[PDB]
Amino acid sequence: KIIILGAGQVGGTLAENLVGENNDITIVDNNADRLRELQDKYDLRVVNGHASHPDVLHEAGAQDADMLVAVTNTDETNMAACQVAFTLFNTPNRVARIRSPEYLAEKEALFKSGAIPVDHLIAPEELVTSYIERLIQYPGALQVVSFAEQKVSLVAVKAYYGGPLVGNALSALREHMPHIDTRVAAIFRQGRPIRPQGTTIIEADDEVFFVAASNHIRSVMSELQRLEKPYRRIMIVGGGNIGASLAKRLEQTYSVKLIERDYQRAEKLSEQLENTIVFCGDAADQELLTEENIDQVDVFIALTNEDETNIMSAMLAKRMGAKKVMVLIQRGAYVDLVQGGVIDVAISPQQATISALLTHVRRADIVNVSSLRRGAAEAIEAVAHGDETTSKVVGRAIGDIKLPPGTTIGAVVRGEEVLIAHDRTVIEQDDHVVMFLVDKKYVPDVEALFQPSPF
Amino acid sequence: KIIILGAGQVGGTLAENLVGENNDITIVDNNADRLRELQDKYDLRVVNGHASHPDVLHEAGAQDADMLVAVTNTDETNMAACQVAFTLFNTPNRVARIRSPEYLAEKEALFKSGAIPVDHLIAPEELVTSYIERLIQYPGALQVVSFAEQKVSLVAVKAYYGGPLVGNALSALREHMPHIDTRVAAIFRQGRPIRPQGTTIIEADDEVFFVAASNHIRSVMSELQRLEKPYRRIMIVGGGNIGASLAKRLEQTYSVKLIERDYQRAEKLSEQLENTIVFCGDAADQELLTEENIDQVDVFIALTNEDETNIMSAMLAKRMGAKKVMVLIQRGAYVDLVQGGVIDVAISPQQATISALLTHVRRADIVNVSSLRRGAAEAIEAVAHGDETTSKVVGRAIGDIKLPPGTTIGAVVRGEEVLIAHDRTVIEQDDHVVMFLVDKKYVPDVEALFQPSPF
Amino acid sequence: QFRSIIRIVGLLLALFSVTMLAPALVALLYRDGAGVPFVTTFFVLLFCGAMCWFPNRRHKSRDGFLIVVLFWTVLGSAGSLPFLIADNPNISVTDAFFESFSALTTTGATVIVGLDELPKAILFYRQFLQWFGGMGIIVLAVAILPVLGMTPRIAETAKALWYIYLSLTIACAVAFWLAGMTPFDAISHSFSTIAIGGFSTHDASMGYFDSYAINLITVVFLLISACNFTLHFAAFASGGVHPKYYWKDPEFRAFIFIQVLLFLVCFLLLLKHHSYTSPYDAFDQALFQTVSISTTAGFTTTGFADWPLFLPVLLLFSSFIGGCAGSTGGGMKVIRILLLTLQGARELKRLVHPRAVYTIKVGGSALPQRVVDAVWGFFSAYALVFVVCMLGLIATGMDELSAFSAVAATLNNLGPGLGEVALHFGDVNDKAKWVLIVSMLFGRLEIFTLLILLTPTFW
Amino acid sequence: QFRSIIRIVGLLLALFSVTMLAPALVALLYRDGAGVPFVTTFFVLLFCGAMCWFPNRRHKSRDGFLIVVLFWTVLGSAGSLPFLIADNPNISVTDAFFESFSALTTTGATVIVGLDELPKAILFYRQFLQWFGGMGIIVLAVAILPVLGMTPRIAETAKALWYIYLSLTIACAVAFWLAGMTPFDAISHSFSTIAIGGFSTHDASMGYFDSYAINLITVVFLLISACNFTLHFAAFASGGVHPKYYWKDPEFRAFIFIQVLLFLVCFLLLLKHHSYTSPYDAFDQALFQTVSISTTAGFTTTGFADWPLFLPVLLLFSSFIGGCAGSTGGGMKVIRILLLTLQGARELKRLVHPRAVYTIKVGGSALPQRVVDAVWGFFSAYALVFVVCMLGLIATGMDELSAFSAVAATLNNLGPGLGEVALHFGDVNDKAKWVLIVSMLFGRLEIFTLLILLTPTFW
Ligand SMILES: Nc1ncnc2c1ncn2[C@@H]1O[C@H](COP(=O)(O)OP(=O)(O)O)[C@@H](O)[C@H]1O
Ligand SMILES: Nc1ncnc2c1ncn2[C@@H]1O[C@H](COP(=O)(O)OP(=O)(O)O)[C@@H](O)[C@H]1O
């Protein structure tokens, strides 16, 4: 039996992908949002009560609980909760999420499990959201998702005017690394998709998707890291616990200007933040952005509390001359909506933790298991279920499958080896197939393609 | 026919004393406060809706309807409010409130021309301050009210250590002005009343009550002004629109220290107020008052929004060494309860205007008409109604009347002349008799004493 | 502030003594029947008022509750005394309290048989009691509304109501005397057709004056008197400002809907059975019996001899949805039923659109949730008082179906109930007669004013 | 997302097709009873389920109303085929719809006379329909709460209820067959005593058996089955955590109060009239008839021949306050009446404390004003549907008093109504028989799911 805790924004996503596979899921939110959300959710039940008192825990604690995921908004309370669980009840393997971050600096003995935390693994919002550094570090990188275990990774890169990808034909990209076996899934240009056969990469908005083994993907990304001139300036409009620590992490390597609306918070930042020019104003007014070289800024990161303020300020910095625009979206309906040409990348803090931690763990298998992103596109990881010829798709060849429109098979994971998809190969039983939709309203049609005749 | 308008900080109180006219009374406040509060604590009429739309006004009648009271917090709205009534509805007797006060500055030339829209009669809620200034002068003058159309005035004075009243026996006070015919009503000492004839005035905060003709009161108060050394130090604990304008009026003649809790308001005061040392702190903490010579201040005025803060801060400044203490009480239940000895005087903005206006208002002649003060004391202006023998009290002498305990008749007004009612009380009296109770729960018995045998 | 009430009680019964003199004078004028008890009662009542008035005291919410309960009870006992003294209706003390309360509490129930051959003083004073308690009803329910389901002058309307209440009884006694009614019976029957009482000087109720015109006049002035008097004030103030200000008030609309529906269903049912040979008769008797019983008046023109048994039961059940909220005489008022309907409709409409803000709008204005909560606290108290009354009557040996009818007749202030206690309450069990008096008192006080007194937390 | 429901309708009547085989198998075992229609209907309904089975929108609010309305209407029309085809009870299409709906909608109403000499297949399928709709009730009302009237799983309780619902029909069929009953009649009468239906294989219902023991067993398992099944879940999970978890639930307390009060008043009244020669018999018949009719079961052991008419009228009126909320049958459940009482009490408690904050507390928890507003929207819908149904039956020429009884019998899902009805619906007007079918449909779905369809705002 698996239990999760807290009202934290992430727990809901941890309560959607994990469902099934012979494990009964329980969520114990805290009182208000937790009651609604708890009521709202598919499958497993929710008891409303503080996540640290033992009485609410006793339902989980001794009745053959599988894994304790204690993810809460507040850290200091979560630690006390994890210890109350361990010392009162067995709770053999537990998880705790603390955005201390100070505690993360010193695991010490408490994270050694003698006292205070008695936890196997700790998940932190801040360092996992510091993958934004990986995004700024790798120029022109919009997204990366992973499939199967760690073997294959899809990547969405952007070709900037003056970059190395503009003008070069796709055949030159394929010939520049003759030892790299990659497969271009699709190319979105001005919002509309394009069929890639050895085309010329238009500078303004081409988005190129790679599907290959992680070793090869990390190698093409390192080569593009070497070729593309690195970013020099960076601008941030949020004073929060994420914005502050991002300014701290970046100030040594880049020239950072940060913006805040709260005078006292701005003062506290200017004290804490050295080498970072900290301002006091709304992220909306142009009279500050233009006055602050908005035409020359490279990356504009929006980390406001409100999503709509992020989206609008960053779309305005994109119009004014910023090269790359990033926002912090806490509403999946928004991230599925604005991460297009105008906004290069939106970072849902829930999916930033979920994708990385969930992908390694358990390699969840379902006829259709999707990785959620933006666009009308979607990237799913179909599993070939059914007997050798009983199933619509098992035993046949990729060129012979009646795939939905826009759907392109990228790679095939066979156990421990990765093969780049081709019409010459034949699908086998229990084979992981990595696919790519251009219009995601055909997600069910692929499920029907892989759903055999019911037994 | 009487109308007043919403919502009214004071207007509600203007709606309780003014209802004594035989002709129809109506009060319409702004919304729920006027109606719900109004219906529950009030008697005959009203009204609804925001001001100053014309739809609410016609309910007043305005068909030679005599009384219009435009109680308003903001002047700019009030002028238009009274104008819509005259033009659309033509109400004849019009009155207005302006705290502009630039308009209050120029209205004597603007409003006394006839061109001005509709509100020749004026009433400012901020000219109560002048009464505070009179209190700061005439040291030891706790209160004065006037009866019989300002013919007779009762005054409550306080005897301070080092003053001219200490040590001197009441006979010496009687001999110091042999041309003044005054009547000592009662003497409150440590809260308990005392029989006053021929007694030595105890220096410690004695309260002495005179009753005399207005000429005699205006002469003895000026004589006490001449003897007692005037006040030189004044401390104020309120930044309010009343406190500010009082500091303005006082700063030129006295050394003023003002206190505020809101830093931005303190800054705005220190800009506006010259010659006034403006502080920033709570009126409660001793660590500021002692540090600021609280033991040496002469007059401590409390003009905070909250009554309880005034009462407590001023009782603390009274304990610490202030000579005279004044507060701003917005609840008559408080002024009737706390203000004796510990708090010398509270400025009810309701009673400050009411006391003068009811006296000027006709006719105020009922079996009992009560002007009320602080404490269990009472000052009434009973009317002796009935023929030579139909009333208990007409034609007979005060020494033969069975007056309630502690009740002392101070003066008797006939026509234009006033008698001090000494001994036999030779009298004409159909005519108005001025009394003084020590316990006001005996007010009805005096009504019963003056109420003739019902037909 | 208990014991400061005695002054008001004394004043009330003193006025009652003057009222008693007026019937006594009528007794002397007609030259029949015992006016001596009336004069004796006047002296006793005035003496009680002075013995109890003693000297007034200081002027000053629970006091108001005590005032109204004392008002109804004391005046009912005062009425009981005149019957107690006289000889022509030789009736037990209980039958006297019953007749006095029912006359005053507007419930048409009676326990004296042989009304025709009775002293014109007594059966005048009965209708006059009905008229008096009629004023008491509308003056309280309109002028004493704190927890008794724009404010103008209290006394000016306290007497404008009396002016309407007299401009009605005059025009109605006049229309009666124009219909061939005896001027005595015309006054005595306007006292009871305007007060919505149900009393008559005859054992046959309105059967004795068997005229189509008298029936139609009773129907008309019953509908007029069942209407909210506050709404008639709009037809009086500043002359006839509108005559169709009525149709805007949705309580009036619900009242006319109920009266028309119940009428035509009773008429069609009275024709399916061929209960009457001439449709002009079925129309008359249906319209009169519906308008009489639904509006809680209590008049009867027939014995239900040929009537199908469904219709008397339907009339008795309809006596729950009585007159309007300001009108004289009622069970649960029609406005509480319009509120019930509106709330059912609201919940229906709020099931289709769950995340929607709907509010009970009556005539354009919204209703505070406290009033709407009080209407259903009243429904609950009504039901749980009805059941206790029925079980009390049954406990005293009264017939069960008859108990349910007597309860629905008294608690509704009807007050003729079908069954064992059909035309006369005289042979009702004595304990059940007291429980009946208690029930009609509950029904006059809107089930709350009295129920509150029984609670220990009150004292 | 209208018109994608047909997939569920097909998948539903396919399950209902599968259910037909068990009564057919019982027909084969006895070998008598003309079981050919059962297999015929099996084929016709499985074919209908296949005819409209195209998956459109599956998954891993306004539609659910049209789901459950078809879960009762469609399934009733499907279950009306066995009666239509068979010959031994040769009954009209209307009588067939009636018997099928009443069997499935748990209302004990019947239109076939001569149940004793009937095919054991058909009168088994009748009790099985009652058992089927019995499961359907608790599976709907507990797991669909748009209209409700620390929190576990939907399916785990959807089957814990099924396990209680089967351990009950077993524990009751066993005691029945132990008290001297055919195992056939024991199953057929536990199918109907647990589902709180009111059906029997005999024209005398539970009067055919004349044993004190079967009466006491029926009383016991009626009280058990009228109780909130969610509360029995506490008696099932982990075993016997308390045996007095029941008495903590104030709904249980109000239910036992009602049953005991109504019992002893019916018993005392059954003794005032000497209706039975032996007080042990008055006790037996009173306890059984109260527990049967008050709990909306519908079983009868006597014809009310010597019973004073008050007792049948009181039982019919008591059928309004039926079973607890989490159980089979009922009209306005007991919890809505406990809420009515509590709100009356609250308005009383406001007697001297106007400024106090009182809240409707049930078992320690407070109720949101939306739920409490819904309970009275339900009271209003009940009343304004009752009146329309009664006027509809009366309009078709049905006897009026009998119409009022048939309405209170069907809307409450009782379903034996006193009067011209008790006990066969044979000679009822045909149009009135359809209006009855509509009313008994209204009884399930708590009068809102169906009423919404008539509303214009829905479409
Ligand atoms: N329009 C805006 N421009 C600049 N900063 C803003 C704007 N709106 C909000 N902020 C700031 O975002 C900062 C940090 O977000 P915060 O509220 O700390 O996030 P959280 O609620 O997760 O703690 C705050 O200082 C807040 O003032
Ligand atoms: N100890 C105190 N507690 C609260 N308020 C204080 C105190 N001392 C000074 N003040 C000030 O009293 C002022 C209120 O003045 P006033 O004009 O009545 O307020 P408003 O304009 O809201 O009426 C505020 O500046 C308030 O901060």
Numbering used by the authors:
A (entry chain G), B (entry chain H): 2 to 456
C (entry chain A), D (entry chain C): 2 to 61, 66 to 154, 174 to 483
From the study:
TrkH, KtrB, and more distantly related KdpA belong to the superfamily of K+ transporters (SKTs) that are found in bacteria, fungi, and plants. TrkH or KtrB proteins assemble with their respective cytosolic partner proteins TrkA or KtrA to form a stable complex. To better understand the mechanism by which the Trk system functions, we determined the structures of TrkH-TrkA complex from V. parahaemalyticus in the presence of ADP (TrkHA-ADP), ATP (TrkHA-ATP), or ATPγS (TrkHA-ATPγS).
